[PDB]
């Protein structure tokens, strides 16, 4: 119903400008007639998920690129897509006027926007916090009598999550992850640096830390929120590195294995939260398959573990086939889920590049590669940051698909927002990846899925300068004659019956 109001900040593409009275949005989602396809197109040149339509034709001739759907060749079911409601994200959202807040939440969570169905919720403070805290900072509280949620949860995160749910048409799944334990549970007695839980799995320190997960889930439940899943620790490898600058808790894979087997698994299993899924790793995929082997070859750990969460920061040297591919082959019934990504974290990168097409293409390239290697979901980091890429108590500034500009009561929707939307809007929970065979080698990135209802979705990313004409064959419905412009991303949808 409303188009992108474009603005250039001198980077390769534009942001879309939203404020208290205006934000780009969609009409109610509908499938066209049997025999018709919808194309959504975004381009570096400025198109933002523009809707066009074409006929599905009876026949096709030529030697051009042909992508044939393999509807009967079935892979993983999708869980979903979304982002992280950090302290930083919550502060940036609530710094907007209430009507601008509502257009930002509708951008992410409504069918008028891109239909996020995953929110990652830090358990207490991380780097994207302005205050260092846990839920149990009173020392030697082993029974966790003094556990409680501060205002960061009760006044900021929890209301924003309810407002997100209220706007959503599809069930939203909450994912919880801790960065640090209380410092009195740790070898080094600090939120950051090299340090693990004191003692060993099975002891008072580890039982207290597992009970903290149940206390967290009890407190959010008091505020009428339920979790889909928790992770065993955010980036457990971080706490093994001397001087790690922010909140962390170190586990070797053996320590994670034994923590899960002895404390976290049983403690959750014997709680009212027994249905909350447990994900292991929550770390760089180069740790696979070794970490999957250590944890899941212990049957007493494996029986508690639903899935393996991965972060994208070292993908450059962790080939998909050797990490995701090999983990799937060894442990096919243990889902893989991407739980954290962002651009701008390198010291030689600027934190925020308003309108960066490169950063959009990093997102869609990552999502396609994950989907081609069995991953069930992909989660962004901060839902929103300021133009500095903050706030962040260690000035570890990064980029976000939405940048809030409080002085103008304005927010900017970057290419990353639309590139993630090409997936999140059009691939509902329960969608299954299906095969998509290329007639010839090509520079395109493409993935096909089937909606639970049986309808088809295909995403085609062109990271080249060259226009590529192509045809998509649905061996049962007919042929889509199309073209993939240079520096474009398309989502195609069509009913099959």
Ligand X SMILES: CCn1cc(CCCCC2=C3C(C)=CC(C)=[N+]3[B-](F)(F)n3c(C)cc(C)c32)nn1
Ligand Y SMILES: *[C@@H]1[C@H](O)[C@@H](O)[C@H](O)[C@@H](Cn2cc(CCCCC3=C4C(C)=CC(C)=[N+]4[B-](F)(F)n4c(C)cc(C)c43)nn2)[C@H]1O
Ligand Z SMILES: *[C@@H]1O[C@H](CO)[C@@H](O[C@@H]2O[C@H](CO)[C@@H](O[C@@H]3O[C@H](CO)[C@@H](O)[C@H](O)[C@@H]3O)[C@H](O)[C@H]2NC(C)=O)[C@H](O)[C@H]1NC(C)=O
Q: Rank residues 8 and 57 by Cβ distance to ligand Z and give the closer one.
A: 8
Q: How far is the CB of 48 from ligand Z (least distance, A)?
A: 14
| 235 tagged catalytic | yes
| By the rule CB under 8 A, 7 interacts with a copy of itself | no
| By the rule CB under 6 A, 165 interacts with ligand Y | no
CA of residue 65 relative to chain centroid, distance? 32
Stretch that binds ligand X, among 61-69, 163-171, 210-218, 343-351 (CB under 6 A): 163-171
Q: Rank residues 177 and 410 by Cβ distance to ligand Y and give the closer one.
A: 177
The secondary element (H helix, E strand) that includes residue 361 is helix 357-371
User: In sequence order, what DSSP letters do the residues of 127-161 get, joined into one string?
Assistant: SS-SS---S--STT-TT-TT----HIIIIIIHHHH
Residues paired with 403 in a beta bridge: 385, 412
Stretch that binds a copy of itself, among 28-36, 118-126, 345-353, 461-469 (CB under 8 A): 345-353
Strand, helix or coil for residue 342: coil
Residues 201-230 that bind ligand X (CB under 6 A): 223-224
Cβ burial of 19 (10 Å; 0-12, 13-18, 19+) is middle
Contact 432, 447 (CB under 8 A): no
Of residues 112, 235, 326, 429, which has the active-site annotation? 235
Stretch that binds ligand Z, among 20-28, 108-116, 318-326, 415-423 (CB under 6 A): 20-28
Of residues 340, 349, 388, 429, which has the active-site annotation? 340
| By the rule CB under 6 A, 470 interacts with ligand Z | no
Q: Where along the sequence are the contacts to ligand NAG (CB under 6 A)?
A: 138, 145-146, 270
Rounded to an integer, what distance in angstroms lies between the CA atom of residue 74 and that of residue 431? 10
Instruction: Give the x-and-dash track for 124-143 against ligand Y (CB under 6 A).
Output: --xxx---------------
Helices (H) then strands (E): counts for the chain: 13, 21
Q: Which of 92, 173, 181, 237 binds a copy of itself (CB under 8 A)?
A: 237
- Crossing angle of helices 158-167 and 98-109, in 10° steps, is 60
Nearest to 15 by CA among 107, 101, 96: 107
Q: Which of 10, 28, 98, 243 binds a copy of itself (CB under 8 A)?
A: 243
Stretch that binds ligand X, among 157-165, 304-312, 357-365, 392-400 (CB under 6 A): 157-165
Q: How far is the CB of 266 from ligand NAG (least distance, A)?
A: 9
Q: How far is the CB of 249 from ligand NAG (least distance, A)?
A: 23
Instruction: Please report which residue ranges of 277-356 form alpha helices under DSSP H.
Output: 290-296, 299-302, 320, 326-330
Q: Which of 15, 17, 103, 447 binds ligand Z (CB under 6 A)?
A: 17
Stretch that binds ligand Z, among 12-20, 59-67, 193-201, 270-278 (CB under 6 A): 12-20
Compute how many other C-beta atoms are within 10 angstroms of the C-beta atom of residue 365.
16
Length of the chain: 497
Q: How far is the CB of 63 from ligand Y (least distance, A)?
A: 42
The entry of ligand X, ligand Y, a copy of itself, none near residue 237 (CB within 5 to 8 angstroms by kind) is: a copy of itself
| By the rule CB under 6 A, 314 interacts with ligand Y | yes
The entry of ligand NAG, a copy of itself, ligand Y, none near residue 249 (CB within 5 to 8 angstroms by kind) is: none
Cβ burial of 408 (10 Å; 0-12, 13-18, 19+) is exposed
| By the rule CB under 8 A, 290 interacts with a copy of itself | yes
Instruction: Please report which residue ranges of 46-132 form alpha helices under DSSP H.
Output: 87-94, 98-109
Cβ burial of 264 (10 Å; 0-12, 13-18, 19+) is buried
Greatest alpha-carbon span in the chain: 75
Q: How far is the CB of 438 from ligand Y (least distance, A)?
A: 31
Q: Which of 6, 159, 266, 478 binds ligand X (CB under 6 A)?
A: 159
Instruction: Give the x-and-dash track for 429-468 against ligand Y (CB under 6 A).
Output: ----------------------------------------
| By the rule CB under 6 A, 22 interacts with ligand Z | yes
Q: Rank residues 45 and 138 by Cβ distance to ligand NAG and give the closer one.
A: 138
Instruction: Please report which residue ranges of 117-252 form alpha helices under DSSP H.
Output: 151, 158-167, 204-222
| 349 tagged catalytic | no
Rounded to an integer, what distance in angstroms lies between the CA atom of residue 391 and that of residue 488? 32
- Say whether the peptide bond before residue 289 is cis (omega within 30 degrees of 0): yes
User: Which stretches of the chain bind ligand Z, using CB under 6 A?
Assistant: 5, 17, 19-22
| Residues found near ligand X in the complex (CB under 6 A) | 158-159, 162-163, 165-166, 223-224
Catalytic residues: 235, 340
């Amino acid at each position: 119903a409303r188009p992108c109001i474009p603005k250039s900040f001198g980077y390769s593409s534009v942001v879309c400008v939203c404020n208290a009275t205006y934000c780009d949005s969609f009409d109610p989602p509908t499938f066209p007639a049997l025999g018709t396809f919808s194309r959504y197109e975004s381009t570096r040149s400025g198109r933002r998920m523009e809707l066009s339509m074409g006929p599905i034709q009876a026949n096709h001739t030529g030697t051009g690129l042909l992508l044939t759907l393999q509807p009967e060749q079935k892979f993983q079911k999708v869980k979903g897509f979304g982002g992280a409601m950090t302290d930083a994200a919550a502060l940036n959202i609530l710094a907007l006027s209430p009507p601008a807040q509502n257009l930002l939440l509708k951008s992410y969570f409504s069918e008028e926007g891109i239909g996020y169905n995953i929110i990652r919720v830090p358990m207490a403070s991380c780097d994207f916090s302005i205050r260092t805290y846990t839920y149990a900072d009173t020392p030697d509280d082993f029974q966790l009598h003094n556990f409680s949620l501060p205002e960061e949860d009760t006044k900021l995160k929890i209301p924003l999550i309810h407002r997100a749910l209220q706007l959503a048409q599809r069930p939203v799944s909450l994912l919880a992850s801790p960065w640090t334990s209380p410092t009195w549970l740790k070898t080094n007695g600090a939120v950051n640096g090299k340090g693990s839980l004191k003692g060993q799995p099975g002891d008072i320190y580890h039982q207290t830390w597992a009970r903290y997960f149940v206390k967290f889930l009890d407190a959010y439940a008091e505020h009428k929120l339920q979790f889909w899943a928790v992770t065993a620790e955010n980036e457990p490898s971080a706490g093994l590195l001397s001087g790690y600058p922010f909140q962390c808790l170190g586990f070797t894979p053996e320590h994670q294995r034994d923590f899960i087997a002895r404390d976290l698994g049983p403690t959750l299993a014997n709680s009212t939260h027994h249905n909350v899924r447990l994900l292991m790793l929550d770390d760089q995929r180069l740790l696979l398959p070794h970490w999957a082997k250590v944890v899941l070859t212990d049957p007493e750990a494996a029986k508690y573990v639903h899935g393996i969460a991965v972060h994208w920061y070292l993908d450059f040297l962790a080939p998909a086939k050797a990490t995701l591919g090999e983990t799937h082959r060894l442990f096919p019934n243990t889902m893989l889920f991407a739980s954290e990504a962002c651009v701008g974290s390198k010291f030689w990168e600027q934190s925020v590049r308003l309108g960066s097409w490169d950063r959009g293409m990093q997102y869609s390239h990552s999502i396609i590669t994950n989907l081609l290697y069995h991953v069930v979901g992909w989660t962004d980091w901060n839902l929103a940051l300021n133009p500095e890429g903050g706030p962040n108590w260690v000035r570890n500034f990064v980029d976000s698909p939405i940048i809030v500009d409080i002085t103008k009561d304005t927010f900017y929707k970057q290419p990353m927002f639309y590139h993630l939307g090409h997936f999140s809007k059009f691939i509902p929970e329960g969608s299954q990846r299906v095969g998509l065979v290329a007639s010839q080698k090509n520079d395109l990135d493409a993935v096909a899925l089937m909606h639970p209802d049986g309808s088809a979705v295909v995403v085609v990313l062109n990271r080249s300068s060259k226009d590529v004409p192509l045809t998509i064959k649905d061996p049962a419905v007919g042929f889509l004659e199309t073209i993939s412009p240079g520096y474009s991303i398309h989502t195609y949808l069509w009913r099959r019956q």
